[PDB]
Amino acid sequence: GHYQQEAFEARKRFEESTTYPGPIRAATPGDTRFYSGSLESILHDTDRHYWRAVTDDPRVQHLIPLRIRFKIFTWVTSGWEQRMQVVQIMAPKDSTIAQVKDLVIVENQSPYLCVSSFHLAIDGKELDPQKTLGEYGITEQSQIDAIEQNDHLLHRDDERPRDWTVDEITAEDVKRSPYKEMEMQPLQNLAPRYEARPKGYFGRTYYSGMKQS
Amino acid sequence: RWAAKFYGQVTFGPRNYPYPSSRWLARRFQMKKHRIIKRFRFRRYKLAAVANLPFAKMIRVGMLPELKSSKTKRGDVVDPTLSGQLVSAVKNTGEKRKGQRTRPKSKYQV
Amino acid sequence: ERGLYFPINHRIVDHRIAPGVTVEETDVQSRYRRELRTNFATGETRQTIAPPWSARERPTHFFSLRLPSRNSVTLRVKEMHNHLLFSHQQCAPMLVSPTKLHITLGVMTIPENSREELVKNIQQSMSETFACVQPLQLRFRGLGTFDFGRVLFIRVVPEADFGRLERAVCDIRRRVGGVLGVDLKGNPHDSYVPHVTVAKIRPNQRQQLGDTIPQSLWADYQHHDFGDVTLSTVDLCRMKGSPDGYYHTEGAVHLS
Amino acid sequence: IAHWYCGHKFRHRFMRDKRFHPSLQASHDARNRFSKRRHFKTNRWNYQQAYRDMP
Amino acid sequence: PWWNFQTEHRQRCVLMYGGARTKNTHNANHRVFIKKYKRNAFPNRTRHHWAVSMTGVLSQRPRRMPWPYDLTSLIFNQPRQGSDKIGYVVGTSMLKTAVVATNHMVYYPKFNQRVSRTKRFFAHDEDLACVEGDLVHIKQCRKISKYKHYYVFSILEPNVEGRERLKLGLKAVPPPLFGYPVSRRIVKLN
Amino acid sequence: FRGADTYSVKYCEQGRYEYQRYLMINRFPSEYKKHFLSFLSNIRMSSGSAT
Amino acid sequence: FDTTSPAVLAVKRALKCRVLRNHLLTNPHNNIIKTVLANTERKLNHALRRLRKVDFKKYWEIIRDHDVQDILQPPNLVTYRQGSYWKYDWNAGLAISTNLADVMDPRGLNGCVETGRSRSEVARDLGLSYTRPLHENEKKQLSHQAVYYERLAKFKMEQPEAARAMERERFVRKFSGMFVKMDIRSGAPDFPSTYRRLLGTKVVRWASKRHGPN
RNA sequence: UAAAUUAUGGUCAAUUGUUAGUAUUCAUAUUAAUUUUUUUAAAUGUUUUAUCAUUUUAUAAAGGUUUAUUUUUGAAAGAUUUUUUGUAUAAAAUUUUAGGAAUAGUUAAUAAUAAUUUAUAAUUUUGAUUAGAUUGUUUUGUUAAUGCUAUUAGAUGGGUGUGGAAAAAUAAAAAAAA
Ligand SMILES: [Mg+2]
Ligand SMILES: [Mg+2]
Ligand SMILES: [Mg+2]
Ligand SMILES: [Mg+2]
Ligand SMILES: [Mg+2]
Ligand SMILES: [Mg+2]
Ligand SMILES: [Mg+2]
């Protein structure tokens, strides 16, 4: 918005200064890992956990915290839900989109995400695995999605996983994949016990951007 | 020393009484001490304190089944190895070996 | 079951993500302790940073403490090379030859026109600054990184005569950059971090070598002790690698 | 002095109060105030060669 | 009304004019100790309970109360009590962890005098400067691990002897000759 | 007697707020940031149309 | 004419001590001199511990000449753990006596009052490293830890199935187990400590209420 | 190392046993209590709603805890036409038994690792852990008084985890959307 161009322009004018001595690092503190409160809070790199009244010199950001979005199928008791999971890397400024794929693959801790090949895309347009973040104007604020192989098949009943509510789960597939891990047959402590949202939660029509009634 | 010098408070006289004990009181307590000691001798008491064991808790060897004086009372339960070793100690304490230092002997020590 | 239910190291809030996002819309997942991993662990070091205009131009000459012959340092660095090359021989182009080992006290850009005025004037000011300073016994242990893990060096511990160095340097810093305006890559009111550069990745090299020296090489030598050295000799050097087989030396001062 | 605390005599109360007295407290000099005698002569026969890494 | 005699009482529901509205808790109850165990067998190794045990904390005679005024508050202005502590480093066996012994103060109002007690803390030194026997400044902070709420703020006095001792490859300090006391007699010869 | 005649006269000779002494209250750096922020966003607006 | 100064005192007491020692070696029981040897040894201990805070190299060479390191050894673990061994040079008044500037450049020994950052932080910022010489323990621990991410990157690049297995177990674990969400009860850093009242009856995991300092 | 006055100021400390040679807080006293008396409590059916459902209605059962109990606003208050922020879970002090010994899903680093990661780990004689007794840091009684002597009650793990917060299975005396 306004911030982005205000600070961009500020940086760009700062770089064209003929006369500047350079900052004194005794006057330019780092950040503290030690502050009150139990939680450990990660902030912007321009920001500190103490009060600093003075505005520090604009720096180019050498580690850009990209966010890459995935679609997961979350099991809730009623049936499957399709929701969103972000993976966040720190990708070096000049890095190549291939390398961004690689960093993204290493950083995900969920078993259900990276199984097949995925393509990075912005507003539905694929990115060249060949070229730099610089060219595509990728910043933290930029919205990056990720698209799997079978994702364009999800409108069918096949690729989309089958919920034991409406579908047979057989000794074929009891031993394979999220079904196996889930332990469909109830145990005393109830197995891994997944989040549940009921059937009448959204009414007769499911969740939408547009009000349908 | 291990044992008790006195039994009960042997110096009880009024303050500034210019001796540790009076004759009267010391005679009373000498009586009580006498009775206790005589009891120790005739019942043939034996105590032991073993290394690498709690010391304040002393195995009473005079109650051990082998060395027990009474024919009736149930004596005590002490480890078989340890009790053998205690029996051997008590036994080989008795007599003077030459070159060893002379140590006081009595009837009631056996 | 073998520890805290929620391990304390895992409790992390990201404030660089908008409020309300993590509660409803989506959850954000990241390995957050790569970033939180500190300046001691990574081995980074914060050097005096250049203003952009100075950052544009290559440095030409530098101040150096010359290491004498028969050093503890040179010997142990040779031992370290042996070990590193036996582990991974991909290091071979990164490593600096033991012949070029020197302590870097500061870096500077001299333009080629004013060259002689500047070298004479510098040399003189340098000789005046170091007039009173007797030789310096400094201690070297530990490794560190400049320029995002591209430069791998031996730290100079502030346990010894180092204190004196700091005043000494900060004087030439206030003469060479303060008095006659010269481009010291930093502020003259700021002190430079002295170091012995061991491995380095130049721009041309970077393609075949990679963008950062993998920490797996020097991890074990990170805190290794290279020993003590007494130093009588200060040089102002231009960087030419073929003139004498040692950095081409434009000026010299003896500490005695 | 309430008679239920500590022993049936009075002086037992003041004998446990000496355990809390300010100027009587345990430190680097006065140690093991409560059982001195269980720890007495404990190391006599324990032979420990003292620690010297310097000549 | 607590200032009125036993016989002077009329209404028990209110204070007529002013003063303190006081509930009488009955202090003299003749409470007693029940003896449930033989003097021979008491079911504890270290201590035995034969009488009525005094209870509470600060209700405990003779009263021992927190004393804010000591060396530490003398030097520091603390936002919260115990936010600053000065102490000595005792041992470093744990990476990035310095154990610190510190003194604080207790006041006995009965005898009108103070005692110093001592307490150990785990402090977090990133970068591992602290050598055993350093005099350090220590602050309260973010919860770091199960037991570490404190970090090393500044080294007041480093240990120069200890550091040079380390540089030579020797331990910072000689290991204590005897450990904790025992109730046994260890006969170990040659 | 708790009445007005029990206290001295000098309580009514006093100017206002003169019983106060300078209070140095420090607090953690973190807490300064929190507090300054709070006061800032309160000065902007405390309540929605109610300000 | 110096007598009372620490170095002198330490030396003369060192000598007296050796003499008395070899004397006791010859004729076994005179307990008068056992006692005088012990007192001398104590006053020697005082003299040496004052020396190392006055000038430490002389302290060193005295210990190396006369071989007394045995009276500098802290007596027992108990009083040492409470830091009353280090507490001596507080009482002697030598605790602040160092005069740093010749050693240990003071710039990175102090923390920032307004910033709140520790001394390791301002040392980080000035690009200085104070670190004690490390033994092989700390070196091999650190050098083992430094490399975690390279090992991990190699693992999840080259061997995705094994990884996905482990992840299955973790992810599913998060739903099983004792507490699924973090609340004051769950997020209690010391569980057995803050709830001691559960320890015998309800909660059987822990047999004691205290595993650490507090 | 000198006195002082423009004179009682800045608002009350005040102790009561008839014993039995003498030494030592110890029977019979007053005050406060239990002995001792039905002038302050109380009965069951909570309530709306769109109908087999969904909205409102969050700390008195017991167990015995002494290094111990700690927290937000997203509910309501609450006011605008819609995206609204940041601050919290952490600690420090005070902790009992006449005669006193070892404790343990265990410390610290790594990390959303490890039922076999790495390490010379952690608690204890400055009194631990088990075990007894016990409801913790404005409440009483006596007294001229540093003391001695009381103070209830209320937070007892998890297992489809709802909810802003578990405080959620009789036991009000809290008006609960005309
Ligand atoms: Mg006789
Ligand atoms: Mg003879
Ligand atoms: Mg805790
Ligand atoms: Mg229990
Ligand atoms: Mg209850
Ligand atoms: Mg208990
Ligand atoms: Mg506490």
Ligand SMILES: [Mg+2]
């Ligand atoms: Mg706490």
Ligand SMILES: [Mg+2]
């Ligand atoms: Mg249950």
